[PDB]
Specification:
- Chain A: Belongs to the TFB1 family.
- Chain A: It comes from Homo sapiens (Human).
- Chain A: This is General transcription factor IIH subunit 1.
- Chain A: It is found in: Nucleus.
- The structure is cut from a larger assembly and holds chains A and B.
- By secondary structure, chain A is mainly α.
- In chain A, 49% of the residues lie in helices and 0% in strands.
- The termini of chain A are far apart.
- Chain B is mostly helical.
- Chain B contains 18 helices and five strands.
- A three-stranded antiparallel beta sheet of chain B has the order 1-3-2, with no helix packed on it. Chain B has a two-stranded antiparallel ribbon with strand order 4-5.
- Chain B is globular.
- Chain B starts with a helix and ends with a helix.
- The chains are: A mainly alpha, B mainly alpha.
- At the A-B interface, helix 2 of A face loops of B.
Amino acid sequence: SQDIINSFQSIRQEMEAYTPKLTQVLSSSAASSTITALSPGGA
Amino acid sequence: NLQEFLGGLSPGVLDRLYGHPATCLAVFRELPSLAKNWVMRMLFLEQPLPQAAVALWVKKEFSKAQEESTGLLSGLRIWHTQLLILNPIFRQNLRIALLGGVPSLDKYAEERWEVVLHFMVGSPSAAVSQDLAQLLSQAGLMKSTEPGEPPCITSAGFQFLLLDTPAQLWYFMLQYLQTAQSRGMDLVEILSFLFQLSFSDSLLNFLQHLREFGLVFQRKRKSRRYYPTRLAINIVVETNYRLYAYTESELQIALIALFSEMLYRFPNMVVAQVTRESVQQAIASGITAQQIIHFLRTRAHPVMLKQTPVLPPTITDQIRLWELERDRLRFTEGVLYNQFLSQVDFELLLAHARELGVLVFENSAKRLMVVTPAGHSDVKRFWKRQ
């Protein structure tokens, strides 16, 4: 029971710096490769 | 319609039309069913996907809705071929809309818009503003044909009264925008101002025209900023032909009297009746029965908007069946020619008759060919000169 008390600690400090929206939500490279994933020739 | 107007437009103004909160959200809000999905799919893309992909993203069933969507979606010039990457002016400003980059307001709007509609009826409390009378007559719903102490109301003005309250305003701005190119300002800044109102120096003069119909509220005689109203967002009927109307506004009563007849008038209720001799009194000017049914379905009572289909079906085709008594004996003009013993020449004349688009009726026994008198002056030349 040692990693629960710090992972709950690490997620509390993370929620102060928040909401980037413009470029930090997606990238042009990863979203374009996703088009190949849901194409009829992909997965 | 909105996309009817933007379809007949040059690309030289649509690129400067796309402001960040106003226009890119407005054109995106009117895209039919599936065009809204493709714009959101390639909103975050940068490399153009191949052209054969979007044909295969739909089923074989409902494949006809694919081309009419992209026919509009390329008609407004949102993407192009590029070899379908979107417009860089459109993709940038729409991404701004995804977080990028007081009862006095309402009661003023209804009483200021009602006096605009009272100008189209006979009333001494008319909208006394000479700029609006010349605005309506060039739009084509206030016939004068004289100087005139009153202005008359033509057949198109009768159809304007029974249009919906958002839908009659879009027909009104489209005639404001179509004539403002030579008397007002550029089309770009006035159209993007309406869409920014939906959510220079010459633009203050356009604001004082919206002050007359009621979409802004000044309240202190042309201050710095305005106050938008609820107009700037964009009764029962029985089996025995009676309609009871819980309104008391004098405009809404005379709109019932166009196609009904009054028989009592209490406070807060008016009972009228849809009869044969009163619908045909309205159709004879032309307020035709597809507009009467749409008038009562948008203005219906909450107790009518229940588990039954609204406007119960006995009364919704009896108004249609009373329209078709005018539909008998459709007159049309023509000129005849006959009395030829040649049994090939009436067949020979068919090769010289159909290609102008002037023939009306065809016969096979005696073969009466009838031509309009606008196209009769040249068919008489062919008969005498072989």
